[PDB]
Amino acid sequence: KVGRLIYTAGGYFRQSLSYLEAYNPSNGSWLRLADLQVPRSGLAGCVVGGLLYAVGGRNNSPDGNTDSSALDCYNPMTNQWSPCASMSVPRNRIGVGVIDGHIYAVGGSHGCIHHSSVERYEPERDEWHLVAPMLTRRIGVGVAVLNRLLYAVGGFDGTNRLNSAECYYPERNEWRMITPMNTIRSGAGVCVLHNCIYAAGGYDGQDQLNSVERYDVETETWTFVAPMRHHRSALGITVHQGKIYVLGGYDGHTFLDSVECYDPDSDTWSEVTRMTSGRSGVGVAVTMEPC
Ligand SMILES: Cc1cc2c(cc1[C@@H](CC(=O)O)c1ccc3ccc(OCC(=O)NC4CCCCCC4)cc3c1)OCO2
Ligand SMILES: [Cl-]
Numbered sequence: 001k002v003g004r005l006i007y008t009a010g011g012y013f014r015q016s017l018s019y020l021e022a023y024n025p026s027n028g029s030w031l032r033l034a035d036l037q038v039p040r041s042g043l044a045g046c047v048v049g050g051l052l053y054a055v056g057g058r059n060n061s062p063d064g065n066t067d068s069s070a071l072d073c074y075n076p077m078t079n080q081w082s083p084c085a086s087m088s089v090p091r092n093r094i095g096v097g098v099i100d101g102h103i104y105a106v107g108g109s110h111g112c113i114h115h116s117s118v119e120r121y122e123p124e125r126d127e128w129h130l131v132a133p134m135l136t137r138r139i140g141v142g143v144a145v146l147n148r149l150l151y152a153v154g155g156f157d158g159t160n161r162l163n164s165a166e167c168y169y170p171e172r173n174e175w176r177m178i179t180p181m182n183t184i185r186s187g188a189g190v191c192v193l194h195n196c197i198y199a200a201g202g203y204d205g206q207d208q209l210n211s212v213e214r215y216d217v218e219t220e221t222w223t224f225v226a227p228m229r230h231h232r233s234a235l236g237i238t239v240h241q242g243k244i245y246v247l248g249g250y251d252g253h254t255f256l257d258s259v260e261c262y263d264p265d266s267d268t269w270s271e272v273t274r275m276t277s278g279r280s281g282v283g284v285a286v287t288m289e290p291c
Helices: none
Strands: 004-009 020-024 029-032 044-048 051-055 058-061 064-067 071-075 080-084 095-099 102-106 118-122 127-131 142-146 149-153 165-169 174-178 189-193 196-200 212-216 221-225 236-240 243-247 258-263 268-274 283-288
Touching: 004 044, 004 051, 004 236, 004 243, 044 095, 044 102, 051 102, 051 283, 095 149, 102 149, 142 196, 149 196, 189 236, 189 243, 196 243, 236 283
Parallel strands: 044 283, 095 142, 142 189
Antiparallel strands: 004 020, 004 283, 020 029, 044 051, 051 071, 058 064, 071 080, 095 102, 102 118, 118 127, 142 149, 149 165, 165 174, 189 196, 196 212, 212 221, 236 243, 243 258, 258 268
């Protein structure tokens, strides 16, 4: 369990960013590591077999905007990024979940297309394959895995921001709707802690949110928990040592450098550190420290 860092990749401030930085919750330290080959915001991060994966996003630059189908893998042992097989389609504002060593890429946009499509990556074969699409097109979708089931939460379908959510059952290759959230949320941070799927922040169509709600898979209910100290949309999120960490985002005025930590035992959020600069739209994941 020791020696794990919170990695933040990419993001957005004025333009899409190539930063890879790692935070050590045990000593407060930040490390700047190998840049992404291509700056990207709206990407997702995940970890399989100790490798950090950056999936999709968009390169926003003064010389254009390209939605990304890329899957790039970072090895902390080498501090090197390597290209992996690309997805079938570009996916900006994607969500990602891992089940049994496989990466699921969910939704996202390509130009004006809002995807319902979903695809699954097999590291052992370096191949992607499409699976059943969601019941709703979703960009800015939050994705988490609980009990080897994949959840897609909120987002924007091209016309409406969503409070709906749905669950993918891999052995049936089938999506089913679940209880909708109490709040419409696009660009929320979604993760799993204990038996619950948490949805923190986001945009409801009018304001950035500091509210946080959690879905109990047993009771099929969403319940609000303590709100964040800051309103945040397009925030990064991960879980580390039984706590939720939220990184950055946009509060309606500033791109935040704040990192907050939620303790479920006290139902409190605390400010724990600041990123090296404010940004939104980052990919976040946890893996061993580099060398
Ligand atoms: C969440 C959101 C907030 C907004 C908004 C549009 C959205 C949605 C889309 C929607 O509701 O159609 C959204 C959802 C998920 C995202 C995930 C990543 C992501 O990275 C690129 C990025 O970081 N851009 C930033 C520039 C400043 C304003 C836009 C949002 C932040 C963007 C995301 C955007 O318009 C202004 O506030
Ligand atoms: Cl964008």
